[PDB]
Amino acid sequence: EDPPACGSIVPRREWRALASECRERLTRPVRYVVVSHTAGSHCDTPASCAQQAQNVQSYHVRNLGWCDVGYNFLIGEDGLVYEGRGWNIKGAHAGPTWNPISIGISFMGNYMNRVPPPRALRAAQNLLACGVALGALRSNYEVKGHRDVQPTLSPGDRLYEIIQTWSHYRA
Ligand X SMILES: C[C@@H]1O[C@@H](O)[C@H](O)[C@H](O)[C@H]1O
Binding site for ligand X (CB under 6 A): 92, 95-99, 150
Distance CA 103, CA 86 (A): 9
Distance CA 107, CA 85 (A): 15
Among 89, 132, 157, 158, binds its own copies (CB under 8 A): 132
Residues forming beta bridges with residue 75, ordered by sequence position:
81, 107
Distance CA 113, CA 115 (A): 7
Binding mask 69-108 for its own copies (x = CB under 8 A): -x-------xxx--------------xxxx-xx-------
- Cβ proximity to its own copies: between 79 and 86 the closer is 79
Q: Which helix (H) or strand (E) holds 104?
A: strand 102-107
Cis status of the peptide bond prior to 29, with omega within 30 of 0:
yes
By the criterion CB under 8 A, which residues form the site for its own copies? Answer: 1-10, 14, 21, 23-24, 27, 31, 38-39, 44-47, 59-60, 63-65, 67, 70, 78-80, 95-98, 100-101, 117-119, 122-123, 125-126, 129, 132-133, 135, 138-140, 148-153, 167, 170-171
